Symmetry: D2
Subunit: 263 residues, 4 copies
């Protein structure tokens, strides 16, 4: 099946930033024709550690910006919702509605997303065991979702640290397509001052592990200049490095593919 | 005074709340050194299964809780799950509770603080004790004056929670601390036998109050059936923690 | 039953240090007559993180020093062994033979201790679940041990951190007397540079929790001047604070005792 | 060359070692790009139960291993549990293995280093990746020249281990890194279905070798029966990791 690559700047810092990243993603989509690219960006960071951190410019602005990306580049779109009422307006532009990790058990949010008819991607909560995502998929199916994804983004491992238990990939594949979040998985929750920390040096090696184990897609946040990002400045991948990373995972996926176990 | 938040996990019926409210009212009259707060959820918005009991809705819930407050004169507390619910709930709830999974949702916290009511935040199973400082700050920014942080366990491997008692003195630096005696022993995805021993630990360490879900017939409860405390055992546990607190309080560290 | 208090300097820095601490422990044993005091000190720190850290002055010197303490003060003695051959010589002075946490599964070490006829205290490994200590007690009984203790000293919680799951106390009590290690439970494994870290501010509160939950004794390392200790300088309790801590736990134990559940 | 350490968990008999040694010898001739090392323990010194299989003793063990080395010309590796065992084991063992629970026992490490043989230390389930730097230093101080660190999982809650692949690049800073594919999926106090996928992960990330326990009839093994790899599946897995390594190696980060 076609491999999915969900990528984009963490937050919608401005419509200009989006178009700049979208342009590169469009270029890569023309090169890597065997990949289905989905542009991602959050119109709101509703769970920042600090009240002083950047959140966004509002739902209205964000949807408008994402719509511009889809219009100008013909790219599929995905963004996350935080309360049930946002599902309807967001579904107007989003091809895939994303459910935040902390909210993966909020029944009404899941139901709100499912009834839009759009695909739904649920970030696996840091508190959830792999086998407990079965009921998450069940809720979505109950709500009408026909295209469901589960995203591995790390599990709570002691304080301010996450570990990726790759056994989750084959387990979750039993009931949904699986995506590996290469950037949030290496972040150190509340690691820094009133902000999240992260170790970019592990992004690439862990993504290689994900494709070797076997997944249906990868999720990566990318920014022209990560150091200047308003969110996840420590983990967002430099846009110039995206091409090489994608090429590498396609190569590893190809050679490992014949060994992927049947679920 | 020492805070004791208790009541049935979910508002299974106005009838159930009244029966429990009566016992809590009696204990309230027997223990003047304690401030009792009646708790019950109008909606279990985060159940694991879509086929599990959620409740009868916000209106039916706020109505039943109002009946408890008016009939017994007890303070009330219930949890909210989305921002719009803060206002209507604040009509009856003296303390607005923020669910553990939602402790980082800025709009929910701000919505609760705006009501002018006290706010009790369940510490997420993914949060470190020191990470709660930011939670309190959000609430203060939102205008909250009476703020509580509730210890309810931390993710420890899969389908298990551990209570790191170091969290009590750490969180006390920025808020009043409550120990959730029933959810802390629950196995996500629990053991009633550990409820009492851990609550004894909490008061020996030092906290500002305890949270306990209680039900007349726990095994018949529509939620947390394996962990809700039988109503008849509530008095004994309260007396026990008051006695332990009386002796141990001499050693509670300053700030 | 008589409450057990195992205390002493972490390592046998010198025979003089031992006698100084022993003198205070003897004084407290005369005051707290309802407590059974056991003097503890390691003749060897065989598991230091760094090859450059203090280990000790040898088994011969240590046993001689411990014997002096028992002779001069009439105090019971306990020390830990690291290899089977040490059980015999150590049993000549030790009333309780201690089994290190990392070695709680080494069958021959356990058997070596059991056949000496002495009491055996096993530190629960940081990797062991409470219910898995049942087989540890089984091995000891198989080897002839008639007086067995299991010591709670924390469990691996993420990297360089330990958490105390107090549910372990009532669980382990099902098959052995339980001791709470108040000082090692708050140490941060490899936290510092080539050494262990620790948070002394949590020693007292956690010990209060242990007695409130219910245990058969407490283990505390104490030193005249912790800051100068050659091992566990961050967690050893100042000797001057021992009296107050013991008084406090006896008071909390008394008031909580009527509520201790029957196993 | 890439290292592949394989063999039956325990020396159940000289007979068993020979049968496994034959297959490993064959693979050794088929894969010249790989250095095979035959492994088997003469004693399971840390079994959970006193009634479980330990072995036939050190002498019988060193004897059987010597037979494998002489008959097939394969390098040998076995683990030691107490200092005195280093010398006699070094007579046949090319690489002396240090058990995970004993990775901090200074005298065992020094005893192994003194033999002049290579030393492979299983990373304790309680150790952080960076904590292994000190382990290597002890060995260097003891005179060790060829040093390996083996990833075999980290304590994750109770009766479960997780493999934090970040450990591979971290440990590589001070030693050659080996990934233990069979013990990493074991549930202390395991799932064979996860052995292959995680070994693929290990080579994609980048390691210097893999460790795998294999047995003709795993379900009949006297130890690690639930995790030992069936002998017949060994060739396929090796070919697979060589292919993945060939492609992925282009991206292994420097130092
Ligand atoms: Zn992000
Ligand atoms: Zn409940
Ligand atoms: Zn010590
Ligand atoms: Zn094995």
């Amino acid at each position: 099946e076609k491999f999915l690559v969900i990528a984009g700047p963490c937050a919608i810092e401005s419509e200009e930033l989006l178009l700049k990243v979208g342009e590169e993603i469009k270029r890569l989509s023309e090169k890597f024709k065997e990949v289905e690219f989905v542009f991602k960006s959050s119109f709101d960071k509703a769970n920042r550690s600090s009240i002083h951190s950047f959140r966004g410019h509002g739902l209205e602005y964000g949807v408008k910006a994402l719509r511009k990306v889809k219009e100008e580049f013909g790219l599929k779109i995905t963004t996350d919702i935080h309360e049930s009422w946002q599902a309807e307006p967001v579904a107007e532009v989003a091809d895939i509605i994303q459910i935040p990790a902390f909210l993966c058990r909020q029944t009404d949010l899941l139901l709100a997303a499912a009834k839009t008819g759009r695909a739904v991607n649920v970030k696996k909560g840091q508190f959830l065991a792999p086998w407990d995502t079965k009921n998450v998929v069940e809720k979505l199916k109950f709500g009408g979702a026909k295209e469901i994804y589960l995203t591995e983004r790390g599990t709570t491992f002691g304080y301010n640290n996450l570990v990726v238990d790759f056994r989750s990939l084959p387990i979750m594949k039993q009931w949904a397509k699986v995506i590996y979040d290469a950037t949030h998985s290496v972040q150190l929750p509340g690691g820094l001052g009133d902000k999240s920390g992260g170790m970019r040096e592990f992004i690439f090696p862990l993504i290689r592990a994900a494709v070797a184990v076997g997944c249906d897609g990868v999720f990566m946040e990318t920014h022209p200049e990560p150091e200047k990002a308003l969110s996840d400045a420590s983990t967002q991948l430099p846009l110039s490095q995206l091409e090489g990373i994608i090429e590498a995972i396609l190569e590893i996926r190809e050679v490992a593919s014949k060994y992927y176990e049947t679920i």
